[PDB]
Design a protein around this ligand. Sequence first.
Ligand SMILES: NC(=O)C1=CN([C@H]2O[C@H](COP(=O)(O)OP(=O)(O)OC[C@H]3O[C@@H](n4cnc5c(N)ncnc54)[C@H](OP(=O)(O)O)[C@@H]3O)[C@@H](O)[C@H]2O)C=CC1
Ligand SMILES: CCc1nc(N)nc(N)c1C#C[C@H](C)c1cc(OC)cc(-c2ccncc2)c1
Length: 157
Amino acid sequence: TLSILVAHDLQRVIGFENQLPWHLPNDLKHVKKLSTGHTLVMGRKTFESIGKPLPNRRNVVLTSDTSFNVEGVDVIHSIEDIYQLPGHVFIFGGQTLFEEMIDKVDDMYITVIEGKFRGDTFFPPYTFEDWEVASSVEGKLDEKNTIPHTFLHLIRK
Ligand SMILES: NC(=O)C1=CN([C@H]2O[C@H](COP(=O)(O)OP(=O)(O)OC[C@H]3O[C@@H](n4cnc5c(N)ncnc54)[C@H](OP(=O)(O)O)[C@@H]3O)[C@@H](O)[C@H]2O)C=CC1
Ligand SMILES: CCc1nc(N)nc(N)c1C#C[C@H](C)c1cc(OC)cc(-c2ccncc2)c1
């Protein structure tokens, strides 16, 4: 199973100056439940922006740097190596790798942030004519989650 896993705002912003533009604890928990025990694949810049591999799952970084090495991180140098990864594989970021993978994945787990943030990194355009809405769940607002958001699982028609 090959999935995209992304949070993006109303204009598909996913990042600003190496940071997430929003603070949404419920989405981090969403990320944890989906991807714990499985595989996250990310381009080099997305990994560096995070700074450490995420615990309790395989962390795979795509880069052309043959000296890249980080404890707890498996390195690949080719898009085609993604297809040899066993198990459930989530494409995690960033804009470049999403552009390379959006036409290849089976499904996408999107968190739509119902806001307009300043961004410099974007998720590719996509149309619902190509994706069936398997589920759409509104996140709950509270104390620490103050931006409306929606969990979409989209599956390729
Ligand atoms: N929500 C998110 O995902 C967030 C992520 N970002 C990041 O995304 C922003 C935009 O950068 P980006 O390019 O989208 O990030 P990215 O896609 O995570 O990193 C791109 C890098 O991945 C490597 N790469 C990609 N395709 C490859 C291929 N076919 N073969 C070999 N290596 C390949 C290469 O690393 P190289 O070979 O150069 O070492 C390239 O420069 C950056 O400012 C980051 O901070 C921003 C903040 C939040
Ligand atoms: C969660 C946000 C998020 N949600 C969803 N549904 N999919 C995603 N692909 C990401 C994401 C992301 C990027 C890689 C990111 C950037 C970052 O820049 C600091 C910190 C984190 C991060 C810090 C702590 N724990 C998990 C992830 C993630």
